[PDB]
mmCIF file of C-alpha atoms in Angstrom:
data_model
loop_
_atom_site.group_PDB
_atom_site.id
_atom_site.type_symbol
_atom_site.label_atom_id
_atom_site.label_comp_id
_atom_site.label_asym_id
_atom_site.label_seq_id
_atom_site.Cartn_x
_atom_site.Cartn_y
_atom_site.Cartn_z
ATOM 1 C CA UNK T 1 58.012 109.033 72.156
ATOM 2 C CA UNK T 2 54.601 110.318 72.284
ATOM 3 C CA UNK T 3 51.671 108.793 73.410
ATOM 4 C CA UNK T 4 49.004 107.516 71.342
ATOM 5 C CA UNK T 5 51.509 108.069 68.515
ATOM 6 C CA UNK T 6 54.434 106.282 68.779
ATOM 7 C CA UNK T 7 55.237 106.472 65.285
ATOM 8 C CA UNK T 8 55.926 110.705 65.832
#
């Protein structure tokens, strides 16, 4: 995933 923005 990515983080900060686990929703990418």
């Amino acid at each position: 995933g990515c983080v900060x923005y686990p929703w990418c």
